[PDB]
């Protein structure tokens, strides 16, 4: 097996682009059935208020200290880039929500083996559908659409069951020196930073697989005294 640990935020347009680019690489990878993908929580703004009422453009402009026009240029670039991945962004509709509860929902989903589908649904909800991913009703609905037990998902969110696990994911990232997302870890050994091209990720997958499958040796001589486990 090859394990791929991916750190990502729901509020992260480059993370969604990166998810698609990774999926393209994985589709090209002959041993894709041997790959285990695990999503890990990362918050770009863990101190974000529950819901920040301003436009994403203005939020971005404040974050990077730039003009509304250049902030718009940035949004436009990301929109155009995402369109090449089949993604239709609607930044004008984005609700600037704290994503802590959404990350908790992905943790809930992953216990049911639906981590990726939940991650995917939340990215779409955030980037394309103008949904508030801090809103409990909204999260419950999205859980239902993914095929989860909507009532159980809601209860887990209200109890904060996966809160610690999310914070641990975030601490893990800090310890690994991960300061920007999306970030890929392969085989617990190799780091790949940002929304890399499919070719790069496919190359990494292939490199790791090859490393774990050396050519069999040609044995010489007879077995001599040896010790084993």
From TrEMBL:
Disulfide bonds join 12-15. Pfam families: DSBA. It comes from the Bacteria. Residues 3-205 form the DSBA-like thioredoxin domain. GO terms for molecular function: oxidoreductase activity. This is FrnE protein. It comes from Deinococcus radiodurans (strain ATCC 13939 / DSM 20539 / JCM 16871 / CCUG 27074 / LMG 4051 / NBRC 15346 / NCIMB 9279 / VKM B-1422 / R1). The lineage of its organism: Bacteria, Thermotogati, Deinococcota, Deinococci, Deinococcales.
